[PDB]
Amino acid sequence: AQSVDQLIKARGKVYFGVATDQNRLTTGKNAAIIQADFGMVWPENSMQWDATEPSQGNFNFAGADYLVNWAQQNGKLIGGGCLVWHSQLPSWVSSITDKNTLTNVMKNHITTLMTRYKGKIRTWDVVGEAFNEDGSLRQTVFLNVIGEDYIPIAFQTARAADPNAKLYIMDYNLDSASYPKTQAIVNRVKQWRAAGVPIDGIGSQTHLSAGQGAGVLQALPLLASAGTPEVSILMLDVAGASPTDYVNVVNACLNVQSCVGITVMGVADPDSVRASTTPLLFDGNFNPKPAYNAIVQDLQQ
Numbered sequence: 261a262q263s264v265d266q267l268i269k270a271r272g273k274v275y276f277g278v279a280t281d282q283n284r285l286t287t288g289k290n291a292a293i294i295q296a297d298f299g300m301v302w303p304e305n306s307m308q309w310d311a312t313e314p315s316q317g318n319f320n321f322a323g324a325d326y327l328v329n330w331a332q333q334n335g336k337l338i339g340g341g342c343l344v345w346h347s348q349l350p351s352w353v354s355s356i357t358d359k360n361t362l363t364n365v366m367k368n369h370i371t372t373l374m375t376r377y378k379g380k381i382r383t384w385d386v387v388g389e390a391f392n393e394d395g396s397l398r399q400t401v402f403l404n405v406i407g408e409d410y411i412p413i414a415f416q417t418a419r420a421a422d423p424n425a426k427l428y429i430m431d432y433n434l435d436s437a438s439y440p441k442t443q444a445i446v447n448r449v450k451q452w453r454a455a456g457v458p459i460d461g462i463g464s465q466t467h468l469s470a471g472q473g474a475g476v477l478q479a480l481p482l483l484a485s486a487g488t489p490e491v492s493i494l495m496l497d498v499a500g501a502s503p504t505d506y507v508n509v510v511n512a513c514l515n516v517q518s519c520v521g522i523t524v525m526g527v528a529d530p531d532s533v534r535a536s537t538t539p540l541l542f543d544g545n546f547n548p549k550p551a552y553n554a555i556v557q558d559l560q561q
């Protein structure tokens with residue numbers, strides 16, 4: 261049928277993307293759909309810390325290499341991440357108690373991953389899920405051991421490793437303008453950038469319930485008011501996959517000049533972590549759902 265990536269590019273955006281990995285690319289009809297309809301791929305798991313650095317200084321790149329090679333052969337942009345994210349850490353990192361040791365470990369992790377793929381990765385998610393729901397910083401091993409400087413250090417280290425990449429901070433529950441986490445991340449990113457921290461983007465990890473798409477029309481412009489060169493929608497899925505919810509999210513990005521694109525959490529409903537809510541754009545037979553066709557219609561205008 262029609263490609264949402266082709267159409268969103270024709271409207272002046274950069275991509276419509278999807279998360280995947282080697283497993284998915286060799287099963288189902290995922291590779292054919294990604295080839296035809298999406299312009300950017302992200303590794304769901306193969307670039308996370310537990311997958312890439314299972315013991316200190318010893319890296320495993322097999323799965324990440326597979327994705328990067330596949331993307332290059334198929335003409336797709338690549339996003340990578342997450343470089344610093346508490347929920348994907350191997351136990352050897354979480355057990356470090358010394359500030360200088362953890363700082364060097366974090367810098368080496370960032371530099372090694374980014375150097376390997378230098379010039380090939382459009383966007384890196386550098387820090388993920390750093391905020392509590394009340395807007396304070398989440399008390400992870402990095403905050404407890406290094407302190408709040410871990411965020412500036414991570415971004416500075418990433419900028420030096422690959423100056424071509426766009427560097428993002430990413431979080432979830434940024435879907436409502438009035439929710440405390442949303443204004444908190446805006447305030448902190450503005451302050452960090454004023455201090456010279458190279459944060460190029462805010463990525464909103466958008467997991468919606470039915471009817472919540474409309475709120476993104478106000479939340480996304482508010483995130484853009486932090487002044488980063490880019491914002492994006494990441495990890496998108498919507499319980500019930502209503503066309504209304506999906507079109508509202510797409511229109512939010514179209515309405516925000518600095519929104520470069522949208523990435524969905526996967527291809528087909530049965531492979532979702534909440535499959536019983538049928539929250540994706542393709543069904544269990546790999547056919548496009550009404551929400552896919554509604555996005556196509558919205559973009560053709």
Ligand SMILES: O=[N+]([O-])c1ccc2nn[nH]c2c1
Nearest residue numbers: 279302341342385494495523
């Ligand atoms: O947009 N994504 O689907 C996605 C998946 C995994 C990630 N890890 N870091 N950033 C990510 C984005």
